[PDB]
Each structure stands twice: as C-alpha cells, then as structure tokens.
C-alpha cells in the first residue's frame, strides 16, 4: 500500500507484480531487513558486493569466511570467464 501511494501522489504506478516480488525477498526470514546493505549482505557471492560499494570490505568477507562459490550468481561465473546462468547460458549443446 505504501510504495503504491508514494508513487501515486505523482501519478506513476508500477505493476502490482514488482511489489509482491520485492516483498518476498526483503522479508523472508521473519524479521524485516533493509537492502541498501543489510539484506544484500546475504548474497552468496561477495564479489557482487565487491561491485556494490567497496571491494575491500567484501573481499575481507570472502577471505574470513572461505566459501567455495557454487558458480551460479552472475558476478562469479562472469568474472571467471565461463558462460553464466544469466539469460542465455543456462544450457549448452
């Protein structure tokens, strides 16, 4: 309701599918998280975060955690040099 009306006092209004998407990601662990940094922190790939604000912080995250990235996120399989799951690239011959 709130996102709708804040766009609606101007006249714009996005289709009620984007809204009911962005809800069931910014709040799916019960609690209500933000996404400027907090929610997006939950990203499997710390390299998309490296692309977000400051490479060093999320490199530090990757080094202290030591996860083997499953190589599905766009950041990872794009930087490694393969073809990625994005758009064209879920499949091959």
């Amino acid at each position: 309701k709130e996102i709708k009306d804040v766009f609606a006092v101007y006249g714009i209004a996005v289709d009620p599918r984007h809204l009911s998407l962005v809800a069931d990601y910014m709040c799916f662990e019960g609690v209500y998280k933000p996404l400027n940094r907090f929610g997006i922190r939950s990203n499997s790939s710390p390299l998309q975060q490296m692309t977000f604000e400051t490479s060093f912080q999320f490199l530090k995250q990757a080094t202290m955690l030591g996860s083997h990235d499953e190589l599905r996120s766009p950041s990872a399989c794009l930087v490694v040099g393969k073809v990625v799951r994005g758009g064209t690239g879920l499949f091959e011959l």
Binding site: L59, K60, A62, T63, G66, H68, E70, L71, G81
Partner: protein, 96 residues
C-alpha cells in the same frame, strides 16, 4: 571461431596463506635496494635480479635458461626483521 577455449572451470576456493609456505617456496632473497645499473646488468641480489626472471633481453635467468621474450617472471621473498600488521585484517585485529 574454429578455435575454442579448452580449460574447464568448476569452482574457486578461498583460503589463507601462512609464512612457511612462501618461505620454503622462495628462490631468491633481495638484499640490495638498487634496481638498475648504468651498464645493463640490473643488480646482484636486487629486486631486478636475474633469478627473479629475465630482463635486458640478451641476459638469461639465473635458475632458468629461458629467455626474455618467453618470460613471465618468478617469485621469491624478502626477510622482514620486524613484524608489521596486515592492513587487510587489521580492523578485525583491532576488534579482537
């Protein structure tokens, strides 16, 4: 085109490096800060030493007979008589 990349990539693994690995894997230790000499020989026991990789093409690496136009270099280390903080994990170091 007709030619394609060959090597296969599954997944990367992150990890921490100890000092003993780079200490035993060293091939040469720099002792002279001079980098280049006016004659053409870069330096003896310097940062541009020949064992670290060829340079001044007519020269040759100390450990490898491989030449300049074929080179990518090698790695050693320098002994630090003092112990300084790592500026990457220094924030978590201060927190701890």
């Amino acid at each position: 085109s007709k030619n394609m990349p060959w090597r296969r990539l599954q997944g990367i693994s992150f990890g921490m490096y100890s000092a003993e690995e780079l200490k035993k894997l060293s091939v040469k230790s720099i002792t002279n800060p001079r980098y280049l000499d006016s004659l053409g020989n870069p330096s003896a026991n310097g940062l541009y030493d020949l064992a670290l990789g060829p340079a001044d093409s007519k020269e040759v690496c100390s450990t490898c007979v491989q030449d300049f136009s074929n080179c990518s270099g090698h790695l050693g280390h320098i002994e630090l008589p003092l112990t300084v903080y790592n500026p990457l994990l220094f924030d978590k170091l201060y927190l701890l």
